[PDB]
Design an enzyme around this catalytic site. Structure first.
Site, PDB file in Angstrom:
ATOM      1  N   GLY E  20       0.665   8.309   2.664  1.00 18.20           N
ATOM      2  CA  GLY E  20       0.617   7.092   2.990  1.00 18.20           C
ATOM      3  C   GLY E  20       1.925   6.321   2.369  1.00 18.20           C
ATOM      4  N   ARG E  24       7.034   9.152  -0.876  1.00 15.22           N
ATOM      5  CA  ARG E  24       6.532  10.779  -1.348  1.00 15.22           C
ATOM      6  C   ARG E  24       7.007  11.756   0.006  1.00 15.22           C
ATOM      7  NH1 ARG E  24       3.403  10.910  -6.086  1.00 15.22           N
ATOM      8  NH2 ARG E  24       5.608  11.762  -6.366  1.00 15.22           N
ATOM      9  N   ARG E  43      12.610   1.637  10.507  1.00 15.52           N
ATOM     10  CA  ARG E  43      11.467   0.774   9.758  1.00 15.52           C
ATOM     11  C   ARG E  43      11.416   1.333   8.315  1.00 15.52           C
ATOM     12  NH1 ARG E  43       8.195  -2.948  12.278  1.00 15.52           N
ATOM     13  NH2 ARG E  43       8.572  -3.449  14.438  1.00 15.52           N
ATOM     14  N   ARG E  87      -3.066  14.694   6.691  1.00 18.36           N
ATOM     15  CA  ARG E  87      -2.927  13.179   5.792  1.00 18.36           C
ATOM     16  C   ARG E  87      -3.204  13.804   4.483  1.00 18.36           C
ATOM     17  NH1 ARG E  87      -3.436   8.765   3.339  1.00 18.36           N
ATOM     18  NH2 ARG E  87      -5.401   8.124   2.436  1.00 18.36           N
ATOM     19  N   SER E  90      -4.528   9.446  -1.497  1.00 15.82           N
ATOM     20  CA  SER E  90      -5.501   9.041  -2.557  1.00 15.82           C
ATOM     21  C   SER E  90      -6.729   8.422  -1.960  1.00 15.82           C
ATOM     22  CB  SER E  90      -4.752   8.349  -3.578  1.00 15.82           C
ATOM     23  OG  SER E  90      -4.447   7.117  -2.996  1.00 15.82           O
ATOM     24  N   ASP E 204      -8.883   6.687  -8.277  1.00 18.88           N
ATOM     25  CA  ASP E 204      -9.772   5.894  -9.112  1.00 18.88           C
ATOM     26  C   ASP E 204     -11.118   5.897  -8.817  1.00 18.88           C
ATOM     27  OD1 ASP E 204      -8.794   4.587  -6.613  1.00 18.88           O
ATOM     28  OD2 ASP E 204     -10.068   2.757  -7.296  1.00 18.88           O
ATOM     29  N   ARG E 217      -1.098  12.966 -12.750  1.00 21.71           N
ATOM     30  CA  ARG E 217      -1.012  12.412 -11.460  1.00 21.71           C
ATOM     31  C   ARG E 217      -0.120  13.348 -10.634  1.00 21.71           C
ATOM     32  NH1 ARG E 217      -5.145  11.225  -9.697  1.00 21.71           N
ATOM     33  NH2 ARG E 217      -4.059  10.255  -7.848  1.00 21.71           N
TER      34      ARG E 217
HETATM   35  C1  LIG Z   1       4.222  -4.742  22.744  1.00 22.43           C
HETATM   36  C2  LIG Z   1       3.524  -4.871  21.188  1.00 22.43           C
HETATM   37  N1  LIG Z   1       2.268  -4.569  21.092  1.00 22.43           N
HETATM   38  C3  LIG Z   1       1.685  -4.693  19.778  1.00 22.43           C
HETATM   39  N2  LIG Z   1       2.277  -5.241  18.768  1.00 22.43           N
HETATM   40  C4  LIG Z   1       3.742  -5.400  18.966  1.00 22.43           C
HETATM   41  C5  LIG Z   1       4.527  -5.222  20.246  1.00 22.43           C
HETATM   42  N3  LIG Z   1       5.674  -5.548  20.105  1.00 22.43           N
HETATM   43  C6  LIG Z   1       5.947  -5.832  18.923  1.00 22.43           C
HETATM   44  N4  LIG Z   1       4.614  -5.685  18.119  1.00 22.43           N
HETATM   45  C7  LIG Z   1       4.989  -5.900  16.840  1.00 22.43           C
HETATM   46  C8  LIG Z   1       4.036  -6.261  15.620  1.00 22.43           C
HETATM   47  C9  LIG Z   1       3.857  -4.829  14.891  1.00 22.43           C
HETATM   48  O1  LIG Z   1       3.889  -5.424  13.297  1.00 22.43           O
HETATM   49  C10 LIG Z   1       4.917  -4.151  15.409  1.00 22.43           C
HETATM   50  C11 LIG Z   1       4.493  -2.805  16.057  1.00 22.43           C
HETATM   51  O2  LIG Z   1       5.549  -2.368  16.797  1.00 22.43           O
HETATM   52  O3  LIG Z   1       5.923  -4.985  16.275  1.00 22.43           O
HETATM   53  C1  LIG Z   2     -10.027   2.185  -4.135  1.00 21.08           C
HETATM   54  C2  LIG Z   2      -9.486   2.414  -2.671  1.00 21.08           C
HETATM   55  N1  LIG Z   2     -10.064   1.622  -1.594  1.00 21.08           N
HETATM   56  C3  LIG Z   2      -9.473   1.574  -0.378  1.00 21.08           C
HETATM   57  N2  LIG Z   2      -8.159   2.603  -0.122  1.00 21.08           N
HETATM   58  C4  LIG Z   2      -7.900   3.105  -1.314  1.00 21.08           C
HETATM   59  C5  LIG Z   2      -8.552   3.077  -2.511  1.00 21.08           C
HETATM   60  N3  LIG Z   2      -7.626   3.872  -3.656  1.00 21.08           N
HETATM   61  C6  LIG Z   2      -6.730   4.498  -2.857  1.00 21.08           C
HETATM   62  N4  LIG Z   2      -6.643   4.211  -1.521  1.00 21.08           N
HETATM   63  C7  LIG Z   2      -5.630   4.568  -0.435  1.00 21.08           C
HETATM   64  C8  LIG Z   2      -5.685   4.502   0.975  1.00 21.08           C
HETATM   65  C9  LIG Z   2      -4.624   3.450   1.267  1.00 21.08           C
HETATM   66  O1  LIG Z   2      -3.545   4.359   2.204  1.00 21.08           O
HETATM   67  C10 LIG Z   2      -4.095   3.197  -0.182  1.00 21.08           C
HETATM   68  C11 LIG Z   2      -4.689   1.605  -0.554  1.00 21.08           C
HETATM   69  O2  LIG Z   2      -4.010   1.489  -1.657  1.00 21.08           O
HETATM   70  O3  LIG Z   2      -4.493   4.016  -0.918  1.00 21.08           O
END
Ligand SMILES: Cc1ncnc2c1ncn2[C@H]1C[C@H](O)[C@@H](CO)O1
Ligand SMILES: Cc1ncnc2c1ncn2[C@H]1C[C@H](O)[C@@H](CO)O1
Ligand SMILES: Cc1ncnc2c1ncn2[C@H]1C[C@H](O)[C@@H](CO)O1
Ligand SMILES: Cc1ncnc2c1ncn2[C@H]1C[C@H](O)[C@@H](CO)O1
Ligand SMILES: Cc1ncnc2c1ncn2[C@H]1C[C@H](O)[C@@H](CO)O1
Ligand SMILES: Cc1ncnc2c1ncn2[C@H]1C[C@H](O)[C@@H](CO)O1
EC number: 2.4.2.1
Lengths: 237, 237, 237, 237, 237, 237
Positions: E20, E24, E43, E87, E90, E204, E217
């Site tokens: 995520g 990493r 991005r 995936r 955590s 956690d 960790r």
């Molecule tokens: C065509 C379309 N559909 C959904 N999200 C869109 C999009 N064009 C741009 N976005 C925007 C919002 C998201 O943060 C990101 C997804 O590529 O750019």
């Molecule tokens: C306590 C808790 N709740 C929801 N998502 C959690 C979490 N602890 C870790 N995560 C995970 C999944 C997300 O990708 C990210 C959110 O901080 O770490």
């Protein structure tokens, strides 16, 4: 003429003010419009057309509830050429800092109705007013030296809610007032390509309720109407 | 007096007939009741009380839509001792073998409203009429020599529905008439502990679009009224 | 410090700009802000704080999607005293009259996400921007000689939706642009009492791929940041 | 023969009584019918046909739950010419004034199942019985001198419900008895064009937990059967 | 190249690990893979491809939330020929017997997101991992002398949920860990016919904050990557 | 003893095999168990207890549908000390590559039932089997030289679906078989802390239907039972 409006194309101005109470429409017509004539009386939902400072304007009631006001606004838009709808009503307040006689403008309207989900494939349709109309209303208010809060309204299907838990929820998310139609009107406006706006005066406080004087409440109601009427004139420019 | 009705306990009979149109209530009071007195006019929702063959009866409009009639039926039950409410309205037909001016009795009422889901934890509440009242209506019709189908009604939130295919679904499941209040009244009746029944006269046909062609009543819309009033007398005996 | 932001009260300004692309955060600090300093790097989400014409401002990306931006906006509001959040991103258009590179301001945001229903007892919460912020943006654009559209945005949970028909529905209801955050941000602002606004540039026209240069993109992007930055100063006046 | 019934057109009468328990069907065939013949045993779901006072009648179990009885009622209607189905089952009471072995007639049936929402475009379908059948049952009871309440039933998917507060909701809305099939049978009856009615005998009390204490029938569970059989004869005349 | 990945067919292995935290990704390529090469940077989402014991493998972050990871996993499957997605992240624990730093494998994933309902006609789609992948992970861990829990994960749309009671429900139903992606990834894999698995380390214990060192960790994190990497080879055998 | 099971603690083994058809339970008992004795016959749902290779095992029917099997599995778990439940039934196939007589193992089960949403606060609960049980079954299958696919099953409430559109949806998302109870059983297992598994043989192809010989179908059914029985023995080790 339609099943709910016994009038003909031309009878209404392209802008219509709409209170919930039909008797309130006669009151508005009588107090602010010149050379006003009655144009509908079907089911007692009195409608009038006259002029405000030379501007042709109409005013007609929409009854209580989304289903009721949905019928009228739709027919006006698709059968009478109405371009703008302005609801002018009352509402109850849930926020502590919102007081009686406060003029609220609903740029958005939440609801427990299912009509917009039916239109929007069971998803969330943000029922919003037309921006320029909200802007014209805010400016008209300022010119008349009146405060006016702009935010979310809540359109309830049940005036007498079975479980009053939603009031805490409404308050939590900043709802300015609770009424019964804005979300429906914003839904029809979006569906048939027209513009709408809802303005309300706070007539009570859900929990507190509070109280004031009639002369003052009536003064505040007139300010609302004046704000609605003047907002239309700004929109023309 | 309640928020929407300016009357006192005793002004209404323990039984009230309610058309959606206040002008129909007026007509009913003038045509069928004796010594009729107007007991309400708030927001134009005319209410009357008089007698029918010596039996004290009231008749008041309820406006269009579930949210509207929910307000009025509730106030009558909690503050005016009303035990029975008989809705006498109009409806649209979806079935090919249902003709204009046909009389239907709603033993049940389907709906696309969310009010009953809000009362029933989002589950399916079968909005049904009071059995004895349905039976009184059936017998009243037979004695008067008037045909009347008993079945499900569909209470719509949108008179101008975006979903036209839903009518096919309604037809497939034998919906006798489409109106806008039944499921809501039955819900209120159950929530506040009262009895209700909805009787309707086909005024439009959603398929053929043949609207209320040929007058607005003259005798059939009167048939509905005779059945309602006579069924009440059977209930007293 | 919060779970996703290793900073302390005071490191962020009371106003924060947030692009979806994290790389744009450093670009903004370097191109528009003076005396910028790094304030966050956890998970590579770089945050910066500096000044624009003397006004303290911060910039940091929010990531794609409601879940991601909901985290950041929430922590910023509850733990870093942020009062206003302006999302500056892109969107796809469904309205033929909405052109590529157009600047749209979301006064409201529809969505197919469940987050707001979870917050609003499964009812319809109208996710809206702060009115003054909308007006500030509209005025700032005009002053920059840029035409801006104000209306509804649609925040999609699935960029690659299996429901192709939904784009027809959005068009029918006037959705100006499709993105993936606004409704989530507006829910957070309402939940924790803060102000928010989403401004987007039309990056593509769904169902109608059209070309655009890289020079044009930077130009439009810079225009959006100028609009947002200038809007903040008007808001201060 | 159908996927779940090994019989041919003619093996069943145009009217069938159906308890959830195949052993109750056997008992009914042995106790009330003459010249009873077993016409099905697939999956153990015993089915019988014989006569009652010269009237050809059938009786077959339907298993526990909406999905189960939906299969059997459907096959009987589409492949065996069955016109009427009368469910004769047991139920649990939630109302304080409802005693064990009390007889209830379900003119309507609420439910937490999704089957009817699946048939009715996710809206509220009022699952109701056939009016004439309800009336025949009422008259049959009076003539036999057996008390019987007419009202709503609640068809549950989970006999061991995780949600105990829903019983309070049921009680508040006057649910006469909790069972597991009614709403489903009424849905099938409507979908495939047939008539149905559900009659039940209170076997448990959900509050006092007083289960079917004192035998399993002996006379009352027989009362239910007498009413069903006699009501059928009234229907023929 | 796709909207979010500037690469061509062949740049990614048929198997991809996805953390995520985007940072990493480079750590994994440097610490566990041989001859790694950069394949994406759009991005700032850095992607790498190399080999582990001769086996071709890629690693790239997915971002926080279902919407974000749904984008990447989809593009990888439909445009880069990826067949398996693992995936590695955590989660927070709600079961008291589930300890900090525990390794959990999500054979299934619950969620409060609407994405799968949108895909499955609003019904319940059971978002599950690929069985062989689960078994491979369990066996790889055992071989590494690590105890692993297999069960249900809960993918939350809101890290900061307003519904505190939901954590009690998750515990009652045995949810092993709470994260924000698994259900979304499992939906994508099912929609486009690919295989997926989510492995998480307990970072956690919700409602019971406990401490852990930074050395611990890294150790646990490295253990998870080894488990995932070794699982792939078993899968090949 | 309970209302549905007339037996006492000790009468059932801590592992119960459950076919839908009660007559199939006698068949299993008679064919694979030694010194088997009948332990229940209430409502004809025959249950037996005997031994398989010295291992105490029980087998009893659960009827058709989630509501039906939910009652039995719950009572067995909470009133008879049953630790493991193994459903052994049939299912229909939607995927082309899935053939008649294929042995399917449901590690997960989708559904159109509402029972799990009721348990999981209207959210998505992934109804899954116990991992070790799926693993034991897969290994037992391999030892007997039988293929066996592991994946998602679909638990339908309506065997006769009103709109056969879901079959394309099921096929699209990789559903291996369609039956009527796995999701319910997995739900109760999770609710009362026990372990369950569902194994099915393909008895038809929703669209294709196809056909084979009885001797071969019966051989395949026995393989399923043998796989179930042998999987238990592996679990003991
Ligand atoms: C065509 C379309 N559909 C959904 N999200 C869109 C999009 N064009 C741009 N976005 C925007 C919002 C998201 O943060 C990101 C997804 O590529 O750019
Ligand atoms: C306590 C808790 N709740 C929801 N998502 C959690 C979490 N602890 C870790 N995560 C995970 C999944 C997300 O990708 C990210 C959110 O901080 O770490
Ligand atoms: C407190 C409250 N709740 C709901 N609707 C309210 C209200 N106060 C005023 N209204 C409005 C909207 C309806 O049209 C009418 C109901 O009395 O006034
Ligand atoms: C098409 C349609 N939909 C809903 N209600 C309808 C209708 N046609 C007629 N009606 C009826 C029910 C209302 O009580 C009344 C509203 O004008 O007409
Ligand atoms: C508490 C409860 N819930 C649902 N159904 C119940 C019940 N108590 C009794 N019943 C009835 C209805 C079924 O037809 C039958 C199942 O054993 O008992
Ligand atoms: C094709 C099909 N659909 C639904 N359920 C099915 C099925 N084929 C077999 N079944 C199963 C599950 C039920 O318990 C029973 C229904 O005949 O067999």
């Amino acid at each position: 003429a339609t099943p709910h409006i016994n009038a003909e194309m031309g009878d209404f101005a392209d802008v219509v003010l709409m209170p919930g109470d039909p008797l309130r429409a006669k009151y508005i017509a009588e107090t602010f419009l010149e050379d006003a004539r009655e144009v509908n009386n079907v089911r007692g939902m009195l409608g009038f057309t006259g002029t405000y400072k030379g501007r042709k304007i109409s005013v007609m009631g929409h009854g209580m509830g989304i289903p009721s006001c949905s019928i009228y606004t739709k027919e006006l838009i698709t059968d009478f050429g109405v371009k703008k709808i302005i609801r002018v009503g009352s509402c109850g307040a849930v926020l502590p800092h919102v007081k009686l006689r406060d003029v609220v403008i609903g740029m958005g309207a939440c609801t427990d109705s299912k009509v917009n989900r039916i239109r929007f494939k069971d998803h969330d349709f943000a029922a919003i007013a037309d921006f320029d109309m909200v802007r014209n209303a805010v400016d008209a208010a300022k010119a008349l030296g009146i405060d006016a809060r702009v935010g979310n309204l809540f359109s309830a299907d049940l005036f007498y809610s079975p479980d009053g838990e939603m009031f805490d929820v409404m308050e939590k998310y900043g709802i300015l007032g609770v009424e019964m139609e804005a979300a429906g009107i914003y839904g029809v406006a979006a569906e048939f390509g027209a513009k709408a706006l809802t303005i309300c005066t706070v007539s009570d406080h859900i929990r507190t309720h509070e109280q004031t004087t009639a002369a003052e409440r009536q003064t505040t109601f007139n300010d609302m109407i004046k704000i609605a009427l003047e907002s239309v004139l700004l929109g023309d420019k």
